[PDB]
Amino acid sequence: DFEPVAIVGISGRFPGAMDIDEFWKNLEEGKDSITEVPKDRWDWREHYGNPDTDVNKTDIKWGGFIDGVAEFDPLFFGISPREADYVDPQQRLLMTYVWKALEDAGCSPQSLSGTGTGIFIGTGNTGYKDLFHRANLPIEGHAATGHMIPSVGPNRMSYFLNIHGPSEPVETASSSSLVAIHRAVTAMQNGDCEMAIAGGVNTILTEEAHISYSKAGMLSTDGRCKTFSADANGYVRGEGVGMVMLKKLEDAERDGNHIYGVIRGTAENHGGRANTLTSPNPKAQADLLVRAYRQADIDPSTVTYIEAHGTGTELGDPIEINGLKAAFKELSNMRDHRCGIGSVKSNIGHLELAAGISGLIKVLLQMKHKTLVKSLHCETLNPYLQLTDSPFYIVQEKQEWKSVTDRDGNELPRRAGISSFGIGGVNAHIVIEEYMPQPNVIVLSAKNKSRLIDRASQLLEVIRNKKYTDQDLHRIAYTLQVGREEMDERLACVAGTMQELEEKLQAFVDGKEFFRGQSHRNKETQTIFTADEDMALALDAWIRKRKYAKLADLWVKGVSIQWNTLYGETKPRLISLPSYPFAKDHYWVPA
Amino acid sequence: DFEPVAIVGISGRFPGAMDIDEFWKNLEEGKDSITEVPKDRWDWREHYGNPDTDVNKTDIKWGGFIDGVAEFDPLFFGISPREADYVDPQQRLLMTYVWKALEDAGCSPQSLSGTGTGIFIGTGNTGYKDLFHRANLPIEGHAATGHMIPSVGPNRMSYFLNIHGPSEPVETASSSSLVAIHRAVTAMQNGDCEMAIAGGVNTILTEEAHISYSKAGMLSTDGRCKTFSADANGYVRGEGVGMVMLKKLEDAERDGNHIYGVIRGTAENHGGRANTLTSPNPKAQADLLVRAYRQADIDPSTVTYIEAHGTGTELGDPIEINGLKAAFKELSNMDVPDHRCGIGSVKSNIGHLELAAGISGLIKVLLQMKHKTLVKSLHCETLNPYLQLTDSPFYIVQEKQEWKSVTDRDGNELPRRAGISSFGIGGVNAHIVIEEYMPEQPNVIVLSAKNKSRLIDRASQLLEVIRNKKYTDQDLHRIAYTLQVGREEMDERLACVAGTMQELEEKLQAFVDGKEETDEFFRGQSHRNKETQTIFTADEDMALALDAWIRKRKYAKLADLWVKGVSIQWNTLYGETKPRLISLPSYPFAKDHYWVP
User: What CATH number does residue B503 fall under?
Assistant: 1.10.1240.100
Mutation for A interface: B87, B164, B192, most A CBs within 10 A: B164
Terminal Cα distance for chain B, rounded = 52
Amino acid (one-letter) located at B67:
D
Domain of B466, CATH number, reads 3.40.47.10
Sign of CA dihedral A326, A331, A333, A339: negative
Question: Strands A392-394, A399-400: parallel, antiparallel or unpaired by DSSP?
Answer: unpaired
Chain A residue with minimal CA distance to B120?
A172
Phi, psi of A247 (to 5 degrees): -130, 150
Residues of A whose CB is below 8 A from B165: 269-270
Contact A151 B424 (CB under 8 A): yes
From residue A504, give the alpha-carbon distance in Å to each of A464, A509, A558, B2: 13, 9, 21, 58
Secondary structure tally for chain A: helices H, strands E: 20, 18
Taking CB atoms within 8 Å and a gap of at least 24, the contacts of A570-573 are A571/A256, A571/A478, A572/A256, A572/A474, A572/A475, A572/A477, A572/A478, A572/A479, A573/A256, A573/A257, A573/A258, A573/A475
Of B140, B145, B212, the CB nearest to A148: B212
As a whole number of angstroms, the distance between CA A163 and CA A539 comes to: 33
Q: B462 and B530 share a domain? A: no
Q: B566 and B596 share a domain? A: no
Decide: residue A457, CB within 10 A, 0-12 exposed, 13-18 middle, 19+ buried.
middle
Longest dimension (CA), chain A: 84
Q: A91 and A147 share a domain? A: yes
Residues linked to residue A415 through DSSP beta bridges, in sequence order: A433
Which of A428, A434, A387 lies closest to A411, judged by CA? Answer: A434
CA atoms within 13 A on the CB side of A239: 29
Which of B279, B353, B359, B269 lies closest to B313, judged by CA? Answer: B279
Which of B124, B29, B145, B147 lies closest to B353, judged by CA? Answer: B124
Q: B501 and B441 share a domain? A: no
Contact B152 A162 (CB under 8 A): no
Domain range for A481 is: 475-569
Residues of A whose CB is below 8 A from B208: 139
Chain B residue with minimal CA distance to A129?
B130
DSSP state letters, A467-523: ---GGGHHHHHHHHHHSS---SEEEEEEESSHHHHHHHHHHHHHT---EEEETTT-H
Amino acid (one-letter) located at A36:
E
As a whole number of angstroms, the distance between CA A125 and CA A88 comes to: 9
Q: A574 and A560 share a domain? A: no
Q: Is B61 within 8 Å of B48 (Cβ atoms)? A: yes
Of B140, B155, B269, the CB nearest to A164: B269
Q: Is A441 within 8 Å of A548 (Cβ atoms)? A: yes
Over the range A231-267, which residues count as b (16 or more CB within 10 Å of their CB) and which as e? ebbbbbbbbbbbbbbbbbbebbbebbbbbbbbbbbbb
Q: B387 and B516 share a domain? A: no
Documented resolution in Å: 2.9
Q: A518 and A557 share a domain? A: yes
Q: A484 and A453 share a domain? A: no
Q: B568 and B442 share a domain? A: no
> How was this entry determined?
X-ray
Measured N-to-C along each axis, helices A89-105 and A152-161 cross at an angle, to the nearest 10 degrees, of 40
As a whole number of angstroms, the distance between CA A304 and CA A360 comes to: 15
Residues linked to residue A430 through DSSP beta bridges, in sequence order: A266, A418
Strands (E), B252-313: 261-270, 303-307
DSSP A371: E
As a whole number of angstroms, the distance between CA A58 and CA A49 comes to: 5
DSSP A557: T
Decide: residue B287, CB within 10 A, 0-12 exposed, 13-18 middle, 19+ buried.
buried
Strands (E), A62-106: 62-63
Sheet containing B521-525, strands listed edge to edge, beginning at the edge strand earlier in sequence? B443-449, B492-498, B521-525
Question: Strands B62-63, B303-307: parallel, antiparallel or unpaired by DSSP?
Answer: unpaired
Contact B171 A171 (CB under 8 A): yes
DSSP A148: I
Of B133, B208, B218, the CB nearest to A139: B208
Q: Identify the helix (H) or strand (E) that includes residue A421.
A: strand A415-421
Q: B67 and B92 share a domain? A: yes
Mutation for B interface: A155, A163, A175, most B CBs within 10 A: A155
Q: Is A343 within 8 Å of A228 (Cβ atoms)? A: yes
Residues of A whose CB is below 8 A from B179: 168
Q: Is B290 left (phi over 0), alpha (psi -120 to 50) or beta?
A: alpha
- Gaps in chain B following residue numbers (C to N > 2.5 A): 334, 439
Contact A133 B130 (CB under 8 A): yes
Chain A residue with minimal CA distance to B166?
A269
Of A113, A150, A166, the CB nearest to B270: A166
Q: Is B159 within 8 Å of A425 (Cβ atoms)? A: yes
Which of B147, B143, B141 lies closest to A216, judged by CA? Answer: B141
DSSP state letters, B39-81: TTT--TTTTBS-TTTSTT-BS--EEB--S-TTB--TTTTT--H
Question: Strands B261-270, B5-13: parallel, antiparallel or unpaired by DSSP?
Answer: antiparallel
Terminal Cα distance for chain A, rounded = 56
Sign of CA dihedral A99, A105, A111, A114: negative
Question: Strands A440-446, A489-495: parallel, antiparallel or unpaired by DSSP?
Answer: antiparallel
DSSP A266: E
As a whole number of angstroms, the distance between CA B308 and CA B289 comes to: 12
As a whole number of angstroms, the distance between CA A440 and CA A552 comes to: 10
Contact A167 B425 (CB under 8 A): no
Contact A155 B172 (CB under 8 A): yes
As a whole number of angstroms, the distance between CA A356 and CA A372 comes to: 18
As a whole number of angstroms, the distance between CA A243 and CA B194 comes to: 31
Count CB neighbours of A209 within 10 A.
Answer: 23
Q: Is A167 within 8 Å of A158 (Cβ atoms)? A: yes
DSSP state letters, B232-256: ---B-BB-EEEEEEEEEHHHHHHHT
DSSP state letters, B114-157: TS--EEEEE----SHHHHHHHTTPPP-TTHIIIII-TTHHHHHH
As a whole number of angstroms, the distance between CA B265 and CA B300 comes to: 13
As a whole number of angstroms, the distance between CA A98 and CA A244 comes to: 8
From residue B269, give the alpha-carbon distance in Å to each of B190, B262, B543: 19, 22, 57
Q: B399 and B531 share a domain? A: no
From residue A252, give the alpha-carbon distance in Å to each of A105, A191, A363, A433, B171: 10, 17, 20, 15, 31
CA distance B35 to chain A (A): 24
Q: Is A407 within 8 Å of A378 (Cβ atoms)? A: no
Of A148, A151, A164, the CB nearest to B172: A151
Dihedral, CA of residue A570, residue A571, residue A575 and residue A581, to nearest 10: -160
What is the domain count for chain B?
Answer: 2
Residues linked to residue A371 through DSSP beta bridges, in sequence order: A400
Mutation for A interface: B120, B151, B211, B268, most A CBs within 10 A: B151
DSSP A369: T
Of A186, A192, A270, the CB nearest to B158: A270
Decide: residue A292, CB within 10 A, 0-12 exposed, 13-18 middle, 19+ buried.
buried
Residues linked to residue A484 through DSSP beta bridges, in sequence order: none
Q: Is B258 within 8 Å of B580 (Cβ atoms)? A: yes
Which of A301, A307, A359, A364 lies closest to A329, judged by CA? Answer: A301
Q: Is A374 within 8 Å of A400 (Cβ atoms)? A: no
Taking CB atoms within 8 Å and a gap of at least 24, the contacts of B137-141 are B137/B596, B137/B597, B138/A55, B138/A56, B139/A56, B139/A208, B139/A211, B139/A212, B139/A215, B140/A212, B140/A215, B140/B86, B141/A51, B141/A212, B141/A213, B141/A214, B141/A215, B141/A216, B141/A217
As a whole number of angstroms, the distance between CA B386 and CA B325 comes to: 13
As a whole number of angstroms, the distance between CA B250 and CA B188 comes to: 12
Q: In sequence order, which residues have a C-beta less than 8 Å from that of residue B498 and are 6 or more positions away?
A: B442, B443, B445, B476, B504, B507
Q: B593 and B572 share a domain? A: no
Query: What Rg do the C-alpha atoms of chain B give, in angstroms?
Result: 25
As a whole number of angstroms, the distance between CA A543 and CA B403 comes to: 68
